[PDB]
Design a protein around this motif. Sequence first.
Motif, mmCIF file in Angstrom:
data_model
loop_
_atom_site.group_PDB
_atom_site.id
_atom_site.type_symbol
_atom_site.label_atom_id
_atom_site.label_comp_id
_atom_site.label_asym_id
_atom_site.label_seq_id
_atom_site.Cartn_x
_atom_site.Cartn_y
_atom_site.Cartn_z
ATOM 1 N N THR A 2 -47.785 -76.637 -21.534
ATOM 2 C CA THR A 2 -47.912 -76.891 -20.098
ATOM 3 C C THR A 2 -49.065 -76.202 -19.396
ATOM 4 O O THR A 2 -49.429 -75.065 -19.710
ATOM 5 C CB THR A 2 -46.600 -76.690 -19.346
ATOM 6 N N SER A 3 -49.631 -76.931 -18.433
ATOM 7 C CA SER A 3 -50.694 -76.558 -17.509
ATOM 8 C C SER A 3 -50.455 -77.399 -16.288
ATOM 9 O O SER A 3 -49.982 -78.538 -16.416
ATOM 10 C CB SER A 3 -52.065 -76.928 -18.071
ATOM 11 N N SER A 4 -50.812 -76.868 -15.108
ATOM 12 C CA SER A 4 -50.765 -77.601 -13.846
ATOM 13 C C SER A 4 -51.715 -78.803 -13.973
ATOM 14 O O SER A 4 -51.337 -79.919 -13.589
ATOM 15 C CB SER A 4 -51.171 -76.699 -12.679
ATOM 16 N N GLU A 5 -52.894 -78.571 -14.613
ATOM 17 C CA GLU A 5 -53.958 -79.539 -14.888
ATOM 18 C C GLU A 5 -53.447 -80.683 -15.748
ATOM 19 O O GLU A 5 -53.705 -81.833 -15.406
ATOM 20 C CB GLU A 5 -55.178 -78.857 -15.548
ATOM 21 N N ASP A 8 -51.017 -82.737 -13.716
ATOM 22 C CA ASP A 8 -51.833 -83.456 -12.763
ATOM 23 C C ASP A 8 -52.514 -84.659 -13.421
ATOM 24 O O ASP A 8 -52.478 -85.757 -12.851
ATOM 25 C CB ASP A 8 -52.842 -82.502 -12.110
ATOM 26 N N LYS A 9 -53.097 -84.452 -14.636
ATOM 27 C CA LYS A 9 -53.738 -85.481 -15.463
ATOM 28 C C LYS A 9 -52.720 -86.531 -15.863
ATOM 29 O O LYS A 9 -53.039 -87.715 -15.832
ATOM 30 C CB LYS A 9 -54.329 -84.868 -16.737
ATOM 31 N N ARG A 12 -51.730 -88.751 -12.715
ATOM 32 C CA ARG A 12 -52.901 -89.568 -12.410
ATOM 33 C C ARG A 12 -53.089 -90.717 -13.417
ATOM 34 O O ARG A 12 -53.376 -91.851 -13.012
ATOM 35 C CB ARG A 12 -54.163 -88.691 -12.220
ATOM 36 N N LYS A 97 -41.891 -76.377 -17.168
ATOM 37 C CA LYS A 97 -42.385 -75.629 -16.012
ATOM 38 C C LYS A 97 -41.203 -75.017 -15.263
ATOM 39 O O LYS A 97 -41.273 -73.875 -14.802
ATOM 40 C CB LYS A 97 -43.201 -76.565 -15.094
ATOM 41 N N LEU A 146 -47.390 -85.481 -7.007
ATOM 42 C CA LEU A 146 -48.765 -85.018 -7.227
ATOM 43 C C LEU A 146 -49.165 -84.043 -6.124
ATOM 44 O O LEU A 146 -49.534 -82.916 -6.439
ATOM 45 C CB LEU A 146 -49.712 -86.230 -7.288
ATOM 46 N N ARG A 147 -49.012 -84.446 -4.837
ATOM 47 C CA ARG A 147 -49.326 -83.651 -3.636
ATOM 48 C C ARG A 147 -48.555 -82.330 -3.654
ATOM 49 O O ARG A 147 -49.159 -81.255 -3.512
ATOM 50 C CB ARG A 147 -48.929 -84.423 -2.361
ATOM 51 N N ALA A 148 -47.222 -82.413 -3.821
ATOM 52 C CA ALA A 148 -46.302 -81.272 -3.872
ATOM 53 C C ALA A 148 -46.625 -80.267 -4.990
ATOM 54 O O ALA A 148 -46.768 -79.068 -4.711
ATOM 55 C CB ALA A 148 -44.869 -81.762 -3.991
ATOM 56 N N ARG A 150 -49.280 -79.389 -6.464
ATOM 57 C CA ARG A 150 -50.420 -78.606 -6.088
ATOM 58 C C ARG A 150 -50.085 -77.303 -5.379
ATOM 59 O O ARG A 150 -50.785 -76.334 -5.522
ATOM 60 C CB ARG A 150 -51.359 -79.428 -5.233
ATOM 61 N N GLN A 151 -49.014 -77.286 -4.613
ATOM 62 C CA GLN A 151 -48.589 -76.076 -3.965
ATOM 63 C C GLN A 151 -47.498 -75.302 -4.683
ATOM 64 O O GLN A 151 -47.026 -74.350 -4.164
ATOM 65 C CB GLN A 151 -48.185 -76.352 -2.532
ATOM 66 N N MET A 152 -47.124 -75.693 -5.889
ATOM 67 C CA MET A 152 -46.077 -75.027 -6.635
ATOM 68 C C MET A 152 -46.572 -74.312 -7.881
ATOM 69 O O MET A 152 -45.664 -73.913 -8.679
ATOM 70 C CB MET A 152 -45.019 -76.015 -7.086
#
Lengths: 152, 211, 200
Positions: A2-5, A8-9, A12, A97, A146-148, A150-152
Amino acid sequence: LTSSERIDKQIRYILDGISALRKETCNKSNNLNLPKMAEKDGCFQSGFNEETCLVKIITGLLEFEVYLEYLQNRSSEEQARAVQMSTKVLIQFLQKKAKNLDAITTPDPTTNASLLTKLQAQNQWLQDMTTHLILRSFKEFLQSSLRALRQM
Amino acid sequence: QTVVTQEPSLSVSPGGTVTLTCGLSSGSVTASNYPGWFQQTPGQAPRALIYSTNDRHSGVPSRFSGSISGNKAALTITGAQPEDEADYYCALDIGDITEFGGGTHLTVLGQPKAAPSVTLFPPSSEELQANKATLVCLISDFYPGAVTVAWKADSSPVKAGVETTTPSKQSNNKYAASSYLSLTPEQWKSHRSYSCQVTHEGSTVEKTVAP
Amino acid sequence: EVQLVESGGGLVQPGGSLRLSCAASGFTFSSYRMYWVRQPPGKGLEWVSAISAGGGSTYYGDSVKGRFTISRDNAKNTVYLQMNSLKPEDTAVYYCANRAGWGMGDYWGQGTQVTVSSASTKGPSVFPLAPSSKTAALGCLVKDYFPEPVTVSWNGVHTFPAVLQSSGLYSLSSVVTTYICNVNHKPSNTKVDKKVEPKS
């Protein structure tokens, strides 16, 4: 791994997959209780809650699975299967996560198999509308996740 | 460990277009890396220009724009201004972290070669009483910022006791610097008069002080 | 507008501890990831640490992982950077920020200076720089002080950058093209007012 990236990928990638499926469906046509974010979930700016939002993301994605299974029967069989299989990786990532805790809820298998036969018994028109509604709703859910995230 | 790569230096002429790139060693830059561009003027705090690849921060001129071109994040300045001469840092979100590139120094061409304003001060009464002596050579408003400071008094050039600041880029993109010469009160009293010679692009501007 | 105020850095001994704060105002703080960036003297930008909206997720640069701790506080709208086992390598200006989201971009604060050195705090020796008898320029020589900064205010103002000596102390000059320079060195709590008169 796991990675936030990577998460996110993955979102997307599925979003571009939904788009490509919507395109190869809207050229033949041209209620449902689908998962949807509400302010109470804590995924929006107003009332943003990290802990409740992550639970709603994982829950919603696990609930969407029966509908992605439905899409598989519905000629670019590899593309609709790729959406389903890419989603499972997204769930695994988010489950990893959230490794701090799990108290979801996970959906009932027999309730899904019954819903699946009911969706498969509709005429072709209703089946094409079902597909459009699944794809739009899944897109809306992934865009908010996706939006959310980003802040977690 | 990932490396964020950006051109060390680049240049452009007024009203010209310039593109600054920002890349990864581990592959292509994507939307998921949420590329950010930060501008830093000397002695100033960084100012965010572009965020999430192509979004402009509040009050950022429309000439600054962001994108992903090829396998890299790109910053395009369309119609460059003298004020655009600064350091540009790129930031990419890799893994769970964020990494900045080394930064790009952008020079806006090819403008006024400015001669330095020199002001030399002899040691004060108070300092001489404290058994110390400092000669103060203040070199300001010069372009380019590279200078040779030669310490004179009795033609022979002062070998040591010289402490010169590295030419520091300042207000109006000018260069302000200073050279200090530490002497004993006997050395100040000894010689006829002390001089500060600054060599800027061959041109030598001199200032002299006497006891 | 949105505001971010960093405090309170300072001079600290190697192996020492410091706690940075970041007061946020003008935005929904509890709805944003916050981060810290450092800028060593004469060097580039370096990312330090980050904290998720609710503090659940914390992230650090692998050169400070074990040493630093990020914390957050609401309704106090404050982020903290607990810095332990401090090394000279941690000397920098530290900036706090919000990650973009909800139609807003990354806003950074003014910054807070953190100095890590075994050397002690020295106040400055102030000497007058007399106007020399034929417009004239008069100054104030601010000698042998540590660490930076020195604030010079009168009463054509040009406060020059300081010189780093072999000793490890700084010296600067402030020039003006009754004249009294007001020298202020907050790290040693020294305030000097010195009238500069033409030599007679």
